[PDB]
Amino acid sequence: GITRDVQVPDVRGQSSADAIATLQNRGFKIRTLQKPDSTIPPDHVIGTDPAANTSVSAGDEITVNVSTGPEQREIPDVSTLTYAEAVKKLTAAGFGRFKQANSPSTPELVGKVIGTNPPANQTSAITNVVIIIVGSG
């Protein structure tokens, strides 16, 4: 037959703790899912899971998606191959902050990227500014 299923209001616009408390008060169980990412939402609740707006039994389980910190990635040495490669491939790797600089190099490297200013072998954040250095002399 039917049981008592109700829809539970979202705690969007408040912190994850606010959501946790509100659901807890109603008897709902909450699971907090956190991810470090490139496409990071704030630690506050901006959105919720459909399960909340769906009519569910009071005391169901609501997953709260929260993100803690932007992810970091190691810089692949593809920069040295082509300027286009450096910017685009690093964007594909997640990076979204670039700064171009040029450094005087031997004519044999003119027009080629000689690397990055920050160490490429280092794991840099998505929001970290990668300074791409082009060899020009």
Nearest to 134 by CA among 79, 97, 92, 88: 79
Per DSSP, what are the bridge partners of residue 101? 133
CA 50 from chain centre, in angstroms, equals: 22
75-94 exposure pattern, b = at least 16 Cβ within 10 A, e = fewer: beebbbeeeeebbebbeebb
> How does strand 113-116 pair with strand 130-135?
antiparallel
Give the C-alpha separation, 38 to 61, whole Å. 27
Give the C-alpha separation, 122 to 97, whole Å. 16
Nearest to 65 by CA among 127, 19, 126: 19
Give the C-alpha separation, 115 to 85, whole Å. 11
Nearest to 64 by CA among 40, 53, 42, 48: 48
Q: What is the CATH number of domain 1-70?
A: 3.30.10.20
- Number of Cβ atoms within 10 Å of the Cβ of 97: 14
Contact 83, 101 (CB under 8 A): no
Architecture field, domain 71-137: 2-Layer Sandwich (3.30)
Please name the helix (run of DSSP H) or strand (run of DSSP E) that holds residue 101, with its range, or none: strand 98-103
Delimiting residues of CATH 3.30.10.20 domain(s) in the chain: 1-70, 71-137
- Number of Cβ atoms within 10 Å of the Cβ of 7: 12
DSSP 125: E
Please name the helix (run of DSSP H) or strand (run of DSSP E) that holds residue 23, with its range, or none: helix 16-26
- Number of Cβ atoms within 10 Å of the Cβ of 3: 5
Give the SS3 label for residue 26: helix
Please name the helix (run of DSSP H) or strand (run of DSSP E) that holds residue 19, with its range, or none: helix 16-26
Give the C-alpha separation, 21 to 19, whole Å. 5
Give the SS3 label for residue 62: strand
Give the SS3 label for residue 20: helix
